[PDB]
RNA sequence: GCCCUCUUCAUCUCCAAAGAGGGC
């Protein structure tokens with residue numbers, strides 16, 4: 001609608017096309033209908049999801065208790081403006097907050113600010129512009145003036161640049177907390193008083209009760225279905241959104257092991273675990289590809305966990321909003337070998353009759369369905385299983401999988417439904433039945449696979 | 458000032474990158 005397609009290098013944009021126009025997909029659909037769904041996908045990755053999704057930490061407060069407190073917070077932020085807060089009927093701990101946008105009649109100001117590409121995404125998701133996110137502002141920008149915020153999506157603007165002619169995209173207007181001289185540090189930089197997409201700010205709303213998580217990511221731990229008193233492993237876990245979710249589903253009864261290769265990233269897990277009141281979590285900085293111990297705290301012996309979650313590192317191109325990804329084709333393909341190494345460690349560490357859930361935050365066939373076919377061939381002890389709840393679409397063709405196997409996977413296609421232009425007259429002219437499905441389809445690009453280990457090794 | 462590479466950290470919701478070297 002409002003934003004152009006995701007700016008991809010000519011090499012990577014065709015690398016995705018080659019996978020989305022494979023012989024398996026263009027035979028089921030049409031050759032003209034296969035490219036239409038691919039170019040529609042490229043147009044949707046630039047836009048934010050039409051819903052804000054929050055996960056209630058049920059170990060410290062109720063869904064009924066946090067929803068009421070969120071209504072109190074939403075009226076303060078929106079100044080009487082009442083946007084509903086739905087509750088997902090399939091995910092008991094997730095609340096849905098519809099996005100108001102895109103607004104297209106916003107008058108642009110002469111005072112400007114450029115922010116980082118990732119900071120620009122958070123603005124489109126309801127965040128304000130804090131101090132370390134501004135990359136450039138107008139020369140002598142007065143503290144307290146209404147300012148036009150733009151996202152440096154190519155990430156090419158140097159810090160403190162007086163001007164910037166490169167590709168920038170309008171994010172809305174707001175009044176600034178600080179001056180340009182004071183910027184070029186923490187605190188509030190630019191309070192978004194008129195964003196293109198309207199959604200609540202969740203910076204420090206209810207740190208012990210909430211966790212802002214995408215719907216397909218909160219669905220992951222539900223699909224994993226941990227049980228109280230089980231030994232669960234989160235191989236790639238930081239910052240621990242799913243790890244804390246798994247601990248909450250077990251009522252903190254059991255053992256949840258969390259790993260990640262970066263020291264500070266692991267510290268975030270420990271803070272989030274303590275902040276949300278989970279004591280069953282134990283986080284370690286460790287290479288998951290080396291987490292298997294043998295004859296001669298990680299590493300662990302094989303067949304040691306009841307369930308294992310591999311939210312593997314990926315190309316991350318199933319992210320929304322994503323208006324520019326300047327990666328190489330080699331950097332996008334950089335994740336396939338590392339995924340297969342982490343997968344091999346999980347299969348060995350999983351107990352017999354254990355459950356393994358594999359998930360990515362990208363859209364590529366080589367990282368989602370091709371890995372499932374590779375796993376079920378290299379690991380005869382594994383067997384694909386149906387998922388509960390089933391929220392996303394079927395698996396994508398091109399990996400030579402069954403129709404019964406594709407029906408068992410959950411791939412979230414942002415191309416599934418058209419982008420809505422939600423103003424406040426639209427919700428008052430809509431039913432709760434339609435918005436629940438829109439939240440299940442207008443999601444980020446995501447993939448979920450679930451296996452079970454038949455025999456031992 | 459404009460344009461390029463390269464090294465890592467990074468967007469999987471909210472304090473959001475900073476180095477190296479080239480061309481005009």
Ligand SMILES: Nc1ncnc2c1ncn2[C@@H]1O[C@H](C[C@@H](N)CC[C@H](N)C(=O)O)[C@@H](O)[C@H]1O
Nearest residue numbers: 236237238239241242260261287288311312313
């Ligand atoms: N060899 C490794 N061992 C452990 N963790 C890794 C390894 N390589 C990458 N990672 C982590 O894997 C994560 C990739 C993410 N997709 C997982 C994030 C996490 N599931 C979340 O809820 O946000 C990153 O945080 C990486 O730091």
